Amino acid sequence: VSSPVHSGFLVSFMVDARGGSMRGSRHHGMRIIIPPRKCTAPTRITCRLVKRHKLANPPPMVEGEGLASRLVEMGPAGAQFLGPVIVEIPHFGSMRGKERELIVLRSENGETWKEHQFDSKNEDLSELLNGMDEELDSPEELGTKRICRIITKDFPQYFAVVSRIKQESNQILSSTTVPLVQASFPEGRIRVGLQAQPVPEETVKKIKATFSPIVTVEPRRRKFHKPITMTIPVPPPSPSLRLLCSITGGTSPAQWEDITGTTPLTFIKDCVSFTTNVSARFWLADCHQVLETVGLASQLYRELICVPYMAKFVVFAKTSLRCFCMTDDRVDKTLEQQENFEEVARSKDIEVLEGKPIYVDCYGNLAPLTQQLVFNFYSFKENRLPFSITSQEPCGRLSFLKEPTKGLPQTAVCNLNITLPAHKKA
Amino acid sequence: AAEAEAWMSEQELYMMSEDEQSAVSMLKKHQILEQAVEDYAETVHQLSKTSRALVADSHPESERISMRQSKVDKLYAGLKDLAEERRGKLDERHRLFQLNREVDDLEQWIAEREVVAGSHELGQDYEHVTMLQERFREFARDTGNIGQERVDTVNNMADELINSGHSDAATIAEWKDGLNEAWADLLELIDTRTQILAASYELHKFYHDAKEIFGRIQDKHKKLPEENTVETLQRMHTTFEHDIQALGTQVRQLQEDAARLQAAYAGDKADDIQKRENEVLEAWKSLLDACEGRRVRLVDT
């Protein structure tokens, strides 16, 4: 005779046993589903994204990791549900097609962080014939929609969505991203994982030397009982081959040194097999000038650690032009709607790099008075670009590219066609 | 006059440079320099008149003089213009900082009231939750009134700065979003606290009502043994039958409450509600047996 509820919430809402499918009206895509007969008392559930202040000791991300979404505050600090409940949070972290993964971190109190594991998943039973139902179409549908689903029997204080290079792990290992990567440790007890990083030729050329996939074992700086055999692909040639290694632990930034002397570099069919008693980052660098490698590697490593973010480009205008690159930022920005701008150009989501500047070019329309102009993309920040701006059509097309050049053409990241309003002369 | 150019250049250096207390003094100093610039204006007007020296028609440096006096005029007029340009920029900083204090004051206020509504104090007994609910409802009424006065005031104040054309009004608007977000977070928190109280009061009423009905049902059962036939028959039909009809309506009404509440809870809390409701029903039925024999009912109902 009674039915579960379904409504939109900014940050908090009340839910009883009857049920609750709640869409976050603030942050689109943020959904929490409480099945029926799941929570026992009437309870105030809060799902908040932290921006007012910086939390003490935020989640411990190693080098190259980065937060997919912001940090989420749960309402009841240690709420317990008999059945499982669903918390869906939109992120803006680009996965580069199975190259990257998402680890789910939780803080119980706010001091320490650990990983959230869920026992199993059975969508029909967990829903418990919920009227709203509509668990998003498929895991692939989640991937295309950039929605992170967390299934849980109890809320912690803080949840964290983290983007990292995918790690292959078990309780004789090999990468599921690059095939010819293998670590041979005699079997027989704890869990360890291995991550293999891809390297692109174009990005390498931007900053003489060739490089292999960065092979990494997640529990770094650990001495195994016996040495472990490592098999790594051979970078193409440009003794020229060299092996780089980094033992910096945890969050600490990596330090690279050349270990060619301490490493018997056996060869097995376009590979390098060798032994090591210590767990650390390993890299092959093939270039004839031996002394240069480490420094040049550092120039690449700093570039590689940068994390990708599916950003949208937006162009406002007023008779003058504002260019935003945004991820979860409030669309129809309040400053513009106040200052009488208009949303002349939107974009599809295109992968861009945080901390890396993106250059703006205009083709077929007016140019700024100005010395070219640029801005960087900082994730979860509002990146604002102001603009000081024949007689047939006002149409113009502007492009956004990571590289500055006119010597050769560089493929663009975004390409927005735009059209002015011509209300009054400016 | 030759030194005056250097003297003006010194002011030119001071005027070009980059909390509320710093800005308020900043502008305090700058106002004095503008008054000092007016003093130079008195020097420039006479100096220009003296430099002219047209009647004498002397020509030793007349071409040079006509340029030095003109440069002095350009030097002073540009300097005065620069004094005004900074004055506006400094005033913007003071106005910007002055408003920021209020936004933070309002933001602190919401943190305070948020704490009040954060308080998830369920209540010791029914007599308590009634005070909680009838107090909190007044606190929400007041907050909702005065809070909106201030947020409207700060938005009016912030709208004036951005509408005024502030050189810093990108973080003014960022602040506006931040405040209005947090305000609409408090109202929303307030509401879910109001709801949570209503739910507690509804359960507390059921538990308190259960004690009273169970007491009344069994208490009226004790009166039955005490309980000629013409007098008793009239006494039962006239008063006793109406008494139970009233008592039964209360039991059924209590039963309705049990069910309404039963939707919203589950598990141990639901079980205890069923235990008390079953407790009332068992006592109620127990009275119905003992009472059945000596009972007069009208044909109609």
XYZ file of N, CA and C in Angstrom, chain A residues 28-250:
669
model
N 25.078 16.573 -11.094
C 24.339 15.657 -11.953
C 25.009 14.290 -12.010
N 24.182 13.244 -12.033
C 24.651 11.878 -12.021
C 24.828 11.267 -10.645
N 24.918 12.093 -9.595
C 25.075 11.613 -8.221
C 23.769 11.008 -7.739
N 23.756 9.691 -7.588
C 22.561 8.944 -7.241
C 22.872 8.044 -6.056
N 21.936 7.963 -5.106
C 22.001 7.010 -3.998
C 20.711 6.210 -3.958
N 20.832 4.891 -3.994
C 19.681 3.999 -3.959
C 19.719 3.232 -2.650
N 18.687 3.420 -1.834
C 18.471 2.669 -0.603
C 17.319 1.704 -0.873
N 17.559 0.399 -0.917
C 16.476 -0.551 -1.195
C 15.449 -0.554 -0.075
N 14.311 -1.225 -0.254
C 13.350 -1.328 0.843
C 13.796 -2.330 1.896
N 13.355 -2.072 3.131
C 13.681 -2.911 4.282
C 15.187 -3.004 4.492
N 15.917 -1.966 4.074
C 17.377 -1.975 4.094
C 17.926 -1.219 5.300
N 17.567 0.055 5.449
C 17.853 0.778 6.683
C 16.683 0.602 7.647
N 16.996 0.475 8.944
C 16.017 0.105 9.970
C 15.267 1.313 10.526
N 15.990 2.335 10.963
C 15.378 3.550 11.478
C 15.179 4.561 10.362
N 14.391 5.604 10.606
C 14.499 6.797 9.768
C 15.825 7.478 10.044
N 16.494 7.876 8.968
C 17.884 8.297 9.025
C 18.121 9.433 8.043
N 19.024 10.342 8.418
C 19.427 11.462 7.567
C 20.746 11.123 6.874
N 20.670 10.817 5.580
C 21.840 10.484 4.777
C 22.336 11.738 4.063
N 23.646 11.983 4.131
C 24.267 13.137 3.501
C 25.320 12.655 2.519
N 25.335 13.250 1.328
C 26.340 12.924 0.323
C 26.902 14.241 -0.207
N 28.050 14.657 0.326
C 28.592 15.978 0.053
C 29.968 15.862 -0.586
N 30.289 16.827 -1.444
C 31.580 16.919 -2.116
C 32.344 18.110 -1.557
N 33.537 17.858 -1.030
C 34.205 18.841 -0.184
C 34.870 19.905 -1.054
N 34.487 21.164 -0.835
C 35.157 22.304 -1.457
C 35.406 23.470 -0.510
N 34.700 23.558 0.622
C 34.853 24.691 1.533
C 36.238 24.718 2.169
N 36.788 23.551 2.494
C 38.062 23.490 3.192
C 38.810 22.233 2.774
N 40.079 22.186 3.157
C 40.958 21.066 2.862
C 40.959 20.130 4.062
N 40.600 18.873 3.833
C 40.595 17.900 4.913
C 42.019 17.533 5.295
N 42.216 17.267 6.583
C 43.529 16.851 7.047
C 43.826 15.457 6.515
N 45.094 15.226 6.159
C 45.602 13.962 5.627
C 44.652 13.385 4.576
N 44.584 13.982 3.384
C 43.720 13.445 2.328
C 44.300 12.143 1.799
N 43.567 11.383 0.981
C 43.963 9.977 0.724
C 45.386 9.856 0.207
N 46.111 8.813 0.646
C 47.518 8.642 0.257
C 47.714 8.103 -1.151
N 47.811 9.002 -2.126
C 48.027 8.625 -3.515
C 49.514 8.608 -3.845
N 49.975 7.518 -4.468
C 51.372 7.441 -4.880
C 51.566 8.406 -6.039
N 52.794 8.476 -6.543
C 53.094 9.387 -7.636
C 52.360 8.958 -8.899
N 51.717 9.927 -9.553
C 50.953 9.663 -10.741
C 49.489 9.393 -10.499
N 49.115 9.031 -9.273
C 47.711 8.878 -8.940
C 47.059 10.249 -8.758
N 45.737 10.270 -8.898
C 44.976 11.500 -8.770
C 43.512 11.202 -8.541
N 42.844 12.100 -7.816
C 41.449 11.883 -7.436
C 40.516 12.056 -8.628
N 39.798 10.983 -8.970
C 38.819 11.018 -10.051
C 37.757 12.084 -9.805
N 36.928 11.895 -8.778
C 35.999 12.918 -8.327
C 36.586 13.619 -7.112
N 35.827 14.551 -6.545
C 36.294 15.153 -5.306
C 36.173 14.116 -4.199
N 36.244 14.563 -2.958
C 36.061 13.682 -1.821
C 34.615 13.803 -1.350
N 34.005 12.666 -1.014
C 32.598 12.614 -0.621
C 32.489 12.360 0.879
N 31.704 13.208 1.543
C 31.334 13.050 2.940
C 30.007 12.307 3.042
N 29.999 11.221 3.810
C 28.779 10.477 4.079
C 28.068 11.044 5.304
N 26.746 10.854 5.341
C 25.912 11.454 6.355
C 26.064 10.860 7.737
N 25.628 9.616 7.908
C 25.848 8.958 9.199
C 27.236 8.340 9.193
N 28.030 8.670 10.215
C 29.450 8.324 10.203
C 29.673 6.823 10.047
N 28.888 6.002 10.735
C 29.108 4.573 10.643
C 27.838 3.807 10.347
N 26.966 4.409 9.537
C 25.653 3.838 9.262
C 25.764 2.391 8.796
N 24.874 1.543 9.299
C 24.837 0.134 8.939
C 23.487 -0.198 8.322
N 23.517 -0.956 7.233
C 22.318 -1.401 6.540
C 22.339 -2.922 6.501
N 21.168 -3.544 6.663
C 21.114 -5.001 6.574
C 21.431 -5.458 5.155
N 20.703 -4.929 4.170
C 21.032 -5.151 2.782
C 22.126 -4.212 2.308
N 22.549 -4.395 1.060
C 23.497 -3.455 0.463
C 22.792 -2.251 -0.142
N 23.533 -1.145 -0.219
C 23.035 0.098 -0.795
C 24.028 0.623 -1.831
N 23.518 1.449 -2.743
C 24.279 1.939 -3.886
C 24.512 3.432 -3.725
N 25.773 3.844 -3.859
C 26.155 5.249 -3.968
C 26.889 5.425 -5.294
N 26.300 6.207 -6.199
C 26.862 6.476 -7.518
C 27.315 7.934 -7.577
N 28.602 8.136 -7.875
C 29.222 9.452 -7.875
C 29.873 9.710 -9.228
N 29.534 10.796 -9.915
C 30.193 11.092 -11.186
C 31.637 11.510 -10.958
N 32.515 11.036 -11.836
C 33.902 11.478 -11.884
C 34.199 12.101 -13.243
N 35.421 12.612 -13.358
C 35.919 13.213 -14.586
C 37.322 12.714 -14.906
N 37.655 11.500 -14.472
C 38.950 10.911 -14.758
C 38.948 10.023 -15.988
N 39.744 10.375 -17.005
C 39.820 9.597 -18.239
C 40.675 8.345 -18.052
N 40.136 7.192 -18.455
C 40.800 5.912 -18.234
C 41.669 5.447 -19.390
N 41.637 6.134 -20.532
C 42.468 5.768 -21.681
C 42.239 4.309 -22.070
N 40.976 3.878 -22.022
C 40.597 2.548 -22.466
C 41.325 1.383 -21.827
N 40.953 1.025 -20.600
C 41.520 -0.086 -19.840
C 42.989 0.126 -19.490
N 43.592 1.245 -19.897
C 44.954 1.552 -19.465
C 44.983 1.894 -17.982
N 43.931 2.557 -17.496
C 43.796 3.011 -16.122
C 42.605 2.327 -15.448
N 42.622 2.342 -14.110
C 41.609 1.757 -13.228
C 41.227 2.770 -12.157
N 40.223 2.417 -11.353
C 39.767 3.238 -10.234
C 39.809 2.414 -8.952
N 40.599 2.869 -7.978
C 40.603 2.299 -6.636
C 39.684 3.141 -5.766
N 38.947 2.475 -4.874
C 37.944 3.103 -4.019
C 38.507 3.172 -2.605
N 38.818 4.378 -2.143
C 39.353 4.560 -0.806
C 38.273 5.062 0.140
N 38.378 4.632 1.395
C 37.465 5.022 2.456
C 38.253 5.358 3.712
N 37.850 6.440 4.373
C 38.319 6.768 5.711
C 37.185 6.546 6.696
N 37.444 5.733 7.719
C 36.397 5.430 8.685
C 36.184 6.599 9.638
N 37.270 7.148 10.181
C 37.204 8.274 11.108
C 37.574 9.609 10.476
N 38.502 9.614 9.522
C 39.103 10.829 9.004
C 40.605 10.859 9.161
N 41.151 9.985 10.001
C 42.598 9.875 10.146
C 43.179 8.979 9.059
N 42.885 7.689 9.115
C 43.546 6.731 8.247
C 42.661 6.362 7.066
N 43.310 5.945 5.977
C 42.641 5.571 4.742
C 42.950 4.120 4.410
N 41.948 3.420 3.885
C 42.115 2.059 3.401
C 41.197 1.879 2.203
N 41.336 0.736 1.537
C 40.574 0.454 0.327
C 39.255 -0.234 0.653
N 38.200 0.193 -0.035
C 36.868 -0.375 0.107
C 36.708 -1.586 -0.806
N 36.475 -2.756 -0.208
C 36.191 -3.989 -0.933
C 34.756 -4.419 -0.662
N 34.086 -4.906 -1.700
C 32.734 -5.435 -1.589
C 32.738 -6.915 -1.951
N 31.946 -7.699 -1.211
C 32.035 -9.156 -1.293
C 31.643 -9.666 -2.676
N 30.456 -9.295 -3.147
C 29.928 -9.803 -4.407
C 28.867 -8.833 -4.910
N 28.390 -9.085 -6.129
C 27.408 -8.213 -6.767
C 26.334 -9.066 -7.426
N 25.077 -8.828 -7.043
C 23.903 -9.450 -7.660
C 22.839 -8.362 -7.760
N 22.682 -7.788 -8.958
C 21.892 -6.566 -9.107
C 20.426 -6.793 -8.757
N 19.856 -7.919 -9.192
C 18.434 -8.170 -8.968
C 18.105 -8.262 -7.480
N 18.878 -9.050 -6.729
C 18.578 -9.256 -5.313
C 18.826 -7.992 -4.489
N 19.921 -7.275 -4.762
C 20.210 -6.051 -4.015
C 19.143 -4.982 -4.244
N 18.625 -4.880 -5.474
C 17.551 -3.930 -5.759
C 16.295 -4.246 -4.953
N 16.043 -5.530 -4.695
C 14.878 -5.997 -3.940
C 13.589 -5.416 -4.524
N 13.425 -5.627 -5.833
C 12.253 -5.187 -6.591
C 11.959 -3.706 -6.362
N 13.010 -2.890 -6.415
C 12.823 -1.460 -6.224
C 12.137 -0.864 -7.447
N 11.164 0.013 -7.188
C 10.353 0.539 -8.271
C 11.167 1.339 -9.263
N 12.058 2.198 -8.762
C 12.898 2.984 -9.657
C 13.803 2.071 -10.468
N 14.488 1.145 -9.791
C 15.369 0.154 -10.420
C 16.296 0.916 -11.367
N 16.379 0.539 -12.644
C 17.141 1.284 -13.648
C 18.610 1.451 -13.258
N 19.202 0.392 -12.703
C 20.655 0.322 -12.608
C 21.244 0.497 -14.002
N 22.145 1.479 -14.150
C 22.537 1.974 -15.468
C 22.989 0.837 -16.374
N 22.760 1.044 -17.677
C 22.509 -0.043 -18.624
C 23.492 -1.198 -18.474
N 24.776 -0.891 -18.354
C 25.797 -1.923 -18.288
C 27.033 -1.318 -17.653
N 27.971 -2.146 -17.194
C 29.276 -1.595 -16.801
C 29.883 -0.748 -17.906
N 29.700 -1.161 -19.166
C 30.106 -0.326 -20.291
C 29.326 0.984 -20.310
N 28.027 0.929 -19.991
C 27.231 2.151 -19.901
C 27.753 3.059 -18.797
N 28.181 2.474 -17.677
C 28.840 3.262 -16.642
C 30.131 3.885 -17.155
N 30.938 3.106 -17.881
C 32.191 3.633 -18.400
C 32.008 4.795 -19.357
N 31.056 4.677 -20.284
C 30.757 5.791 -21.180
C 30.145 6.976 -20.438
N 29.451 6.728 -19.322
C 28.755 7.782 -18.591
C 29.591 8.412 -17.484
N 30.777 7.868 -17.199
C 31.669 8.379 -16.150
C 30.971 8.434 -14.788
N 30.359 7.314 -14.398
C 29.673 7.177 -13.114
C 30.337 6.049 -12.331
N 30.828 6.361 -11.127
C 31.479 5.376 -10.265
C 30.454 4.798 -9.299
N 30.191 3.501 -9.419
C 29.261 2.811 -8.533
C 29.981 2.180 -7.347
N 29.522 2.507 -6.145
C 30.019 1.904 -4.915
C 28.874 1.138 -4.278
N 29.043 -0.175 -4.151
C 28.120 -1.028 -3.414
C 28.699 -1.251 -2.023
N 27.874 -1.042 -0.994
C 28.344 -1.082 0.384
C 27.231 -1.504 1.336
N 27.639 -2.169 2.418
C 26.754 -2.506 3.523
C 26.799 -1.465 4.636
N 27.781 -0.561 4.620
C 27.875 0.473 5.639
C 28.655 1.666 5.098
N 28.228 2.884 5.484
C 28.933 4.110 5.103
C 30.147 4.356 5.992
N 31.310 4.699 5.417
C 32.381 5.287 6.224
C 32.217 6.793 6.302
N 33.120 7.459 7.019
C 33.072 8.913 7.095
C 33.284 9.523 5.721
N 34.412 9.188 5.089
C 34.818 9.735 3.800
C 35.048 8.623 2.784
N 34.513 8.811 1.585
C 34.858 7.982 0.444
C 35.699 8.787 -0.549
N 36.599 8.095 -1.245
C 37.510 8.737 -2.183
C 37.580 7.901 -3.447
N 37.495 8.556 -4.600
C 37.585 7.875 -5.883
C 38.929 8.263 -6.478
N 39.776 7.270 -6.738
C 41.160 7.508 -7.127
C 41.410 6.875 -8.486
N 42.127 7.603 -9.346
C 42.507 7.135 -10.675
C 43.989 6.778 -10.694
N 44.296 5.573 -11.176
C 45.659 5.062 -11.186
C 45.881 4.218 -12.433
N 47.155 3.965 -12.727
C 47.511 2.991 -13.750
C 47.095 1.607 -13.268
N 46.402 0.859 -14.129
C 45.852 -0.438 -13.739
C 46.944 -1.379 -13.238
N 46.634 -2.117 -12.179
C 47.568 -3.054 -11.570
C 46.997 -4.458 -11.668
N 47.814 -5.385 -12.152
C 47.458 -6.793 -12.175
C 47.969 -7.402 -10.875
N 47.076 -8.040 -10.119
C 47.419 -8.513 -8.787
C 46.747 -9.850 -8.511
N 47.274 -10.548 -7.509
C 46.725 -11.824 -7.069
C 47.151 -12.034 -5.617
N 46.778 -13.181 -5.054
C 47.134 -13.502 -3.670
C 48.410 -14.340 -3.592
N 54.380 -15.799 -10.534
C 54.260 -15.833 -11.987
C 53.128 -14.899 -12.438
N 53.401 -13.599 -12.408
C 52.435 -12.567 -12.754
C 52.813 -11.900 -14.076
N 51.839 -11.218 -14.681
C 52.041 -10.596 -15.985
C 50.984 -9.527 -16.212
N 51.330 -8.551 -17.048
C 50.453 -7.416 -17.300
C 49.332 -7.764 -18.272
N 48.153 -7.205 -18.006
C 47.008 -7.295 -18.900
C 46.888 -6.081 -19.812
N 47.844 -5.154 -19.747
C 47.887 -3.978 -20.610
C 48.972 -4.096 -21.666
N 50.179 -4.472 -21.260
C 51.259 -4.813 -22.174
C 51.567 -6.291 -21.966
N 51.453 -7.129 -22.999
C 51.612 -8.583 -22.788
C 52.976 -8.990 -22.251
N 54.055 -8.593 -22.928
C 55.393 -9.106 -22.633
C 56.007 -8.399 -21.421
N 55.330 -8.546 -20.283
C 55.825 -8.086 -18.988
C 55.514 -9.185 -17.986
N 56.536 -9.688 -17.300
C 56.331 -10.811 -16.399
C 57.271 -10.705 -15.208
N 56.765 -11.083 -14.039
C 57.559 -11.185 -12.821
C 57.451 -12.613 -12.303
N 58.590 -13.291 -12.163
C 58.615 -14.686 -11.721
C 59.078 -14.755 -10.271
N 58.126 -14.922 -9.364
C 58.407 -15.160 -7.962
C 57.954 -16.562 -7.587
N 58.827 -17.391 -7.011
C 58.424 -18.755 -6.632
C 57.156 -18.768 -5.782
N 56.200 -19.611 -6.182
C 54.882 -19.662 -5.559
C 54.940 -20.234 -4.139
N 53.948 -19.859 -3.338
C 53.861 -20.313 -1.963
C 54.736 -19.526 -1.011
N 52.717 -15.861 2.566
C 51.645 -15.720 1.582
C 50.906 -14.394 1.751
N 51.013 -13.522 0.747
C 50.375 -12.209 0.796
C 50.076 -11.740 -0.624
N 49.405 -10.598 -0.749
C 48.936 -10.090 -2.031
C 49.899 -9.024 -2.519
N 50.269 -9.125 -3.794
C 51.168 -8.192 -4.461
C 50.706 -8.000 -5.900
N 50.897 -6.785 -6.423
C 50.462 -6.469 -7.765
C 51.555 -5.800 -8.573
N 51.426 -5.929 -9.896
C 52.361 -5.375 -10.869
C 51.627 -4.505 -11.879
N 52.128 -3.290 -12.102
C 51.532 -2.373 -13.064
C 52.535 -2.068 -14.171
N 52.063 -2.070 -15.417
C 52.878 -1.729 -16.576
C 52.284 -0.486 -17.223
N 53.134 0.525 -17.464
C 52.762 1.838 -17.990
C 53.099 1.942 -19.462
N 52.196 2.420 -20.309
C 52.545 2.602 -21.719
C 53.240 3.941 -21.935
N 54.045 4.004 -22.994
C 54.747 5.236 -23.359
C 54.420 5.581 -24.810
N 54.061 6.833 -25.115
C 53.733 7.181 -26.507
C 54.914 7.785 -27.249
N 55.037 7.490 -28.545
C 56.164 8.014 -29.312
C 56.086 9.527 -29.475
N 54.898 10.061 -29.771
C 54.772 11.496 -30.009
C 55.132 12.293 -28.764
N 54.611 11.871 -27.609
C 54.918 12.533 -26.344
C 56.404 12.444 -25.998
N 57.047 11.318 -26.326
C 58.488 11.179 -26.108
C 59.270 12.170 -26.971
N 58.865 12.331 -28.236
C 59.580 13.218 -29.152
C 59.543 14.672 -28.693
N 58.400 15.122 -28.165
C 58.270 16.499 -27.688
C 59.406 16.886 -26.750
N 59.803 15.976 -25.865
C 60.932 16.222 -24.980
C 61.921 15.062 -25.061
N 66.242 11.395 -29.287
C 67.536 11.316 -28.617
C 67.671 10.042 -27.782
N 66.537 9.466 -27.378
C 66.533 8.290 -26.517
C 65.184 7.587 -26.616
N 65.200 6.262 -26.467
C 63.989 5.449 -26.511
C 63.725 4.787 -25.164
N 62.454 4.462 -24.924
C 62.014 4.073 -23.596
C 61.030 2.914 -23.682
N 61.068 2.043 -22.659
C 60.191 0.878 -22.535
C 58.992 1.200 -21.643
N 58.034 0.281 -21.483
C 56.950 0.533 -20.526
C 57.488 0.570 -19.107
N 56.988 1.517 -18.315
C 57.441 1.629 -16.931
C 56.834 0.466 -16.162
N 57.661 -0.485 -15.768
C 57.195 -1.621 -14.992
C 57.287 -1.251 -13.520
N 56.182 -1.433 -12.798
C 56.088 -1.082 -11.389
C 55.372 -2.178 -10.625
N 55.855 -2.445 -9.418
C 55.217 -3.367 -8.486
C 54.654 -2.514 -7.353
N 53.356 -2.666 -7.082
C 52.703 -1.722 -6.176
C 53.336 -1.688 -4.794
N 53.651 -2.832 -4.131
C 54.303 -2.749 -2.798
C 55.805 -2.545 -2.971
N 56.177 -1.285 -3.161
C 57.555 -0.935 -3.438
C 58.399 -1.030 -2.172
N 59.711 -0.982 -2.374
C 60.705 -1.038 -1.305
C 60.448 -2.185 -0.328
N 60.183 -3.365 -0.884
C 59.991 -4.583 -0.106
C 61.005 -5.627 -0.558
N 61.737 -6.209 0.392
C 62.757 -7.205 0.076
C 62.139 -8.593 0.161
N 62.067 -9.285 -0.974
C 61.519 -10.632 -0.990
C 62.522 -11.613 -0.386
N 62.020 -12.799 -0.021
C 62.884 -13.813 0.581
C 64.010 -14.206 -0.372
N 63.693 -14.334 -1.652
C 64.605 -14.736 -2.710
C 64.433 -13.770 -3.871
N 65.445 -13.629 -4.731
C 65.316 -12.698 -5.859
C 64.251 -13.132 -6.857
N 63.630 -12.134 -7.486
C 62.502 -12.327 -8.394
C 62.948 -12.027 -9.823
N 62.627 -12.936 -10.745
C 62.953 -12.737 -12.152
C 62.006 -11.716 -12.775
N 62.563 -10.781 -13.542
C 61.789 -9.734 -14.195
C 62.021 -9.790 -15.694
N 60.933 -9.755 -16.456
C 60.976 -9.767 -17.910
C 60.292 -8.508 -18.416
N 61.003 -7.746 -19.237
C 60.549 -6.431 -19.680
C 60.771 -6.368 -21.188
N 59.891 -5.742 -21.969
C 60.162 -5.605 -23.405
C 61.367 -4.710 -23.652
N 61.909 -4.815 -24.858
C 63.117 -4.092 -25.249
C 62.710 -2.871 -26.069
N 63.039 -1.655 -25.631
C 62.719 -0.483 -26.439
C 63.514 -0.487 -27.734
N 62.979 0.107 -28.801
C 63.688 0.091 -30.079
C 64.989 0.866 -29.983
N 65.997 0.483 -30.760
C 67.283 1.182 -30.675
C 67.258 2.550 -31.337
N 68.114 3.431 -30.826
C 68.353 4.734 -31.431
C 69.862 4.923 -31.523
N 77.685 0.253 -24.730
C 76.338 -0.328 -24.670
C 75.247 0.743 -24.590
N 74.367 0.781 -25.594
C 73.357 1.833 -25.666
C 72.186 1.576 -24.719
N 71.783 0.316 -24.564
C 70.686 -0.039 -23.669
C 71.073 0.176 -22.206
N 70.139 0.720 -21.420
C 70.360 0.970 -19.999
C 69.072 0.700 -19.223
N 69.225 0.300 -17.958
C 68.107 -0.022 -17.073
C 68.056 0.976 -15.922
N 66.927 1.663 -15.788
C 66.705 2.638 -14.731
C 65.839 2.049 -13.616
N 66.039 2.555 -12.391
C 65.388 2.016 -11.199
C 65.099 3.124 -10.185
N 63.956 3.015 -9.491
C 63.534 3.976 -8.468
C 62.951 3.252 -7.263
N 63.450 3.569 -6.063
C 63.046 2.901 -4.830
C 62.341 3.836 -3.852
N 61.952 5.035 -4.276
C 61.264 5.934 -3.356
C 59.913 5.349 -2.965
N 59.617 5.372 -1.666
C 58.411 4.750 -1.151
C 57.191 5.657 -1.119
N 56.026 5.031 -1.268
C 54.756 5.702 -1.044
C 54.577 6.975 -1.840
